[PDB]
């Protein structure tokens, strides 16, 4: 249990904090001589819900079209497990959630 | 209702076909039906053999359309 | 009009 | 230079492989081929009663040649067509499973295909050998 090929999966609704955490981890993986693969932009998922505007059923048939974009990025690191987890706490962000899988 | 096109080929019509089709600028399924009074299915088998017998030259080959001309 | 009427 | 299946038109290659497979006679034909319709969406059985099974097996062999581990469920969708629902709009419906499963099973006992790892049905070591042969005897005219 030392140096491993380690995956960090990043998902969030907003891209600004996602790219800051992504760049900050990449920055810390640069000055630290750790070979890295990423970030990989997964195809963004558009969660769309189309309801009727009318609470009742009177009027012209008008519809809302709500959206919820989900952006997912995965980054591959080659480092021991202790090093990668402390990197996560350095780049902790409320919006972006992190899951680590070996 | 008035069509009553002949579907069985007798001998009087057979040699009349071989005597009339060569003297045509353009023969097709409808041309055979229109003037020889034979049915569409009987026209299609007549065209496929008349080409095999050399009397008729195939201008264009197609399932829905058979364009033929005289070979003389 | 209406008025719940009983039988049993 | 050589000849492959991909170098010959599909429509007249199958008409040639169908002719060989019928004259060879070794393909086992199930007993209901004179009764059944190819798909539940169809309304009539095939018009070429004597030869339709051979031609469909020829089509199945060629289609499997060009791909990797195609299943039998995928074959039903491929040969399926638009069903004639009376007043409701048309819809795509899959073909009959037994006809396709018997063909691939029949093709499996003639030596052209076999069950591939991770699902599907691969083409046999000899399956490539004999299809490419038929292609050569197709284009000489």
């Amino acid at each position: 249990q030392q140096i491993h090929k380690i995956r960090i999966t990043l998902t969030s609704t907003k891209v600004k904090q996602l790219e800051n955490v992504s760049a900050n981890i990449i920055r810390n993986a640069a000055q630290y001589n750790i070979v890295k693969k990423g970030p990989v932009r997964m195809p963004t998922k558009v969660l769309k819900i189309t309801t009727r505007k009318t609470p009742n059923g009177e009027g012209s048939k008008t519809w809302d079209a709500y959206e919820m974009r989900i952006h997912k990025r995965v980054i591959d690191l080659q480092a021991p497990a202790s090093t990668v987890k402390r990197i996560t706490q350095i780049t902790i962000e409320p919006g972006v959630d992190v899951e680590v899988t070996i | 209702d008035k069509a009553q096109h002949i579907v069985i080929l007798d001998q009087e019509k057979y040699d009349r076909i071989l005597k009339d089709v060569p003297t045509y600028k353009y023969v097709s399924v409808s041309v055979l039906v229109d003037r020889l009074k034979i049915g569409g299915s009987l026209a299609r088998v007549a065209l496929r053999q008349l080409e095999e017998d050399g009397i008729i030259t195939p201008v264009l080959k197609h399932s829905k359309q058979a364009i033929y001309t005289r070979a003389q | 009009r209406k008025k719940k009427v009983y039988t049993t | 230079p050589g000849v492959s299946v991909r170098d010959v038109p599909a429509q007249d290659f199958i008409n040639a492989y169908a002719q060989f497979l019928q004259r060879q006679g070794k393909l086992e034909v199930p007993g209901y081929v004179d009764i059944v319709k190819t798909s539940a969406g169809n309304d009539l059985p095939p018009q070429e009663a004597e030869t339709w099974f051979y031609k469909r097996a020829a089509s199945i062999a060629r289609h499997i040649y060009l791909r990797k581990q195609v299943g039998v469920g995928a074959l039903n969708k491929l040969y399926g067509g638009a069903k004639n629902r009376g007043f409701r709009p048309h819809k795509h419906v899959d073909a009959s499973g037994s006809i396709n499963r018997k063909c691939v099973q029949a093709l499996q006992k003639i030596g052209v295909l076999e069950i591939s790892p991770k699902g599907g049905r691969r083409i046999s070591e000899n399956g490539q050998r004999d299809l490419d042969r038929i292609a050569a005897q197709t284009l000489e005219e």
Partner: protein, 206 residues
């Protein structure tokens, strides 16, 4: 005469084209005559095409249709009556077959006959209506070359469409009969009855 072969072999007959672009490698444009001075700029035969299917953008500006090939304008008008909209590949088949029938008959160049049938089918004066909110007040007016050309294609294909309805004669050879008769100016053909009747009414309004 230069019979090249590539590694991907190319048939002999199709190689006979680095020479001239003939429609359906049979129909040359070199020998074609818009036999009317007034429609030369609106019957486009200067740019040869192989197949009457270009998928161009001729509906963006106002007069881009005059730049569309004349055969492609004819095959566009065939796919009508709901069930045929968007079926261009079927429409090209009718045109390809129609030209061969026009070739075996009268032996002329099939696309020359098409040009003759279009110039002879467009009415030169149509009587437009100028009714002031209901009353009948017909007035005779002139016809522009563009509307003259494109109404000819509309009338020629409409007549062929109705002649092939519930008739053993196929649409390709109903179009051939419609085009051949109108090309030679015969009054038996549809779209020549209409053109004369249009120009006849215009004479009854001046």
């Amino acid at each position: 005469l230069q019979v090249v072969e590539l590694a991907t072999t190319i048939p002999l007959d199709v190689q006979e084209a680095q020479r001239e672009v003939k429609l359906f490698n049979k129909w040359s444009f070199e020998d074609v005559e818009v036999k009317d001075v007034s429609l030369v700029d609106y019957i486009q035969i200067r740019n040869p095409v192989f197949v009457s299917h270009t998928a161009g953008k001729y509906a963006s500006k106002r007069f881009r249709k005059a730049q569309c090939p004349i055969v492609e304008r004819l095959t566009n008008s065939l796919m009508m009556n709901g069930r045929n909209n968007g079926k261009k590949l079927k429409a090209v088949r009718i045109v390809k077959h129609a030209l061969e029938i026009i070739h075996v008959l009268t032996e002329q160049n099939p696309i020359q006959v098409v040009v003759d049938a279009i110039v002879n089918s467009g009415a030169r004066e149509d009587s437009t209506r100028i009714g002031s909110s209901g009353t009948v007040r017909r007035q005779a007016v002139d016809v522009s070359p563009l509307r003259r050309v494109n109404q000819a294609i509309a009338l020629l294909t409409i007549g062929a469409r109705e002649a092939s309805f519930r008739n053993i004669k196929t649409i390709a050879e109903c179009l051939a009969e419609e085009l051949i008769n109108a090309a030679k100016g015969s009054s038996t053909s549809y779209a020549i009855k209409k053109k004369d009747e249009l120009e006849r009414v215009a004479k009854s309004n001046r």
